[PDB]
């Protein structure tokens, strides 16, 4: 279950027998797996981003190019929301948050 298309073919890549070729590398790496481990990939012949980057909601972006995600909604990175008193930007996957306080 991928939901996607593969109308250009970019290069072939053909399954291993006895498995002495491995690719070249390890798993894959998505913008939740780069630090979660991948179960054990079963054939899994798939198109996207060159090596290098990562999945996110069917776009290629990488590491740094990943936006922050609040509760289910995606708002625009490098922006900022209010949460009561204090507030922050979004910037790094992570909130950052400007350094004065409320309380």
């Known amino acids: 279950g991928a939901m996607g298309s593969?109308?250009?073919?970019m290069?072939?890549?053909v399954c291993p027998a006895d498995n002495l070729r491995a690719?070249?590398?390890?798993?894959?790496?998505?913008?939740?797996?780069?630090?979660l481990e991948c179960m054990s990939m079963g054939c899994v012949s798939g198109?996207?981003?060159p090596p290098g980057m990562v999945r996110h909601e069917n776009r290629c972006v990488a590491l740094e190019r990943?936006?922050?995600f609040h509760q289910g909604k995606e708002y625009a990175?490098?922006?900022t929301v209010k949460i009561g008193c204090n507030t922050c930007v979004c910037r790094d996957?992570?909130?950052?948050?400007?350094?004065?306080?409320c309380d």
């Open 47 to 49: 198109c996207l981003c």
């Open 6 to 9: 593969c109308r250009p073919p």
């Open 77 to 79: 990175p490098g922006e």
């Open 23 to 35: 690719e070249g590398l390890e798993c894959t790496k998505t913008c939740q797996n780069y630090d």
């Open 66 to 68: 990943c936006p922050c």
């Open 11 to 13: 290069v072939k890549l």
């Open 93 to 101: 996957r992570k909130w950052n948050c400007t350094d004065h306080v």
